[PDB]
C-alpha cells in the first residue's frame, strides 16, 4: 503493498516497509500488507497487488500498525492517530 | 506449506521454514504458511496442504516474509524483491 503519502507516514510514525493492516470501512475487508512511501503531498493511498481484490478505489480505510513492546513501554504508550480528509490531507493528529 | 525453489529462497533471503504470507493475485486469497525448500532450478512453487483450497496451480502469487526489527535496523532496512518469469526464473532482484 500500500502506497502511502509519506507525509502521512511521517505523521503516523509508520516506517516505509512496515507491516500494516488495512481495515475496510466501506466493505469490511481486513488484510495485512506493508507500507510503501508515496509522493509527498499527493495524498496517495494506493492498493497494489492482490489487495486490489479486496480494497477498491474510493474505499474508506484504516491503516494500523502494531509493535512489540516491553511491559514498561506498553504501559506508557500513547498511540498516534492521524485524521485526514477526503483527499487524505491531515486534519489532526491525536496521541494517546 | 509452500514448496519453493531454493534458488528463489536464496535470492529472497527467506529461510526454509520461515513463515510467509501468500497473496493471490489471481483470486485474491490471502494466507499464512511457511516455506519449504524445493528442487533448485525447478522453479517450483508448490501449494501443499489446506492451502490448496485457496491457491491453485497457475495462480499468480506474492510470497512475503516479515521480520521483527529494532528501531535502528528498521530504519535502515532495504527489503528484497525477487522478480520472476512465468517459470519462476529470476529476472531481477531489487533492494530497498
Amino acid at each position: 503493498x500500500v502506497t502511502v503519502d509519506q507525509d502521512l507516514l511521517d505523521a503516523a510514525g509508520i516506517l516505509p516497509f512496515e507491516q500494516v493492516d488495512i481495515y475496510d470501512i466501506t466493505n469490511g475487508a481486513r488484510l495485512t500488507t506493508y507500507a510503501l512511501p508515496g509522493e509527498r503531498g499527493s495524498g496517495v493511498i494506493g492498493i497494489n497487488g492482490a489487495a486490489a481484490h479486496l480494497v477498491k478505489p474510493g474505499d474508506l480505510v484504516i491503516l494500523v500498525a502494531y509493535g512489540v513492546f516491553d511491559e514498561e513501554e506498553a504501559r506508557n504508550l500513547k498511540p498516534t492517530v492521524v485524521l485526514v480528509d477526503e483527499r487524505n490531507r491531515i486534519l489532526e493528529v491525536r496521541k494517546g | 506449506x509452500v514448496t519453493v525453489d531454493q534458488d528463489l529462497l536464496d535470492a529472497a533471503g527467506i529461510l526454509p521454514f520461515e513463515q510467509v504470507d501468500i497473496y493471490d493475485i489471481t483470486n485474491g486469497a490471502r494466507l499464512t504458511t511457511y516455506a519449504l525448500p524445493g528442487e533448485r532450478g525447478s522453479g517450483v512453487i508448490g501449494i501443499n496442504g489446506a492451502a490448496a483450497h485457496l491457491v491453485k496451480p497457475g495462480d499468480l502469487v506474492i510470497l512475503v516474509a516479515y521480520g521483527v526489527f529494532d528501531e535502528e535496523e528498521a530504519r535502515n532496512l532495504k527489503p528484497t524483491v525477487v522478480l520472476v518469469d512465468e517459470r519462476n526464473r529470476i529476472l531481477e532482484v531489487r533492494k530497498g
Partner: peptide, 24 residues
C-alpha cells in the same frame, strides 16, 4: 512478556488508486 500493541494508524483514509498488477 512482550506485548503487541497498536502504535499508530491512519484513520479513515480514502483509497485513491489501485494496481493489481503492480510490479515492485
Amino acid at each position: 512478556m512482550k506485548r503487541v500493541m497498536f502504535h499508530a494508524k491512519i484513520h479513515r483514509a480514502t483509497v485513491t488508486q489501485a494496481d493489481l498488477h503492480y510490479v515492485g
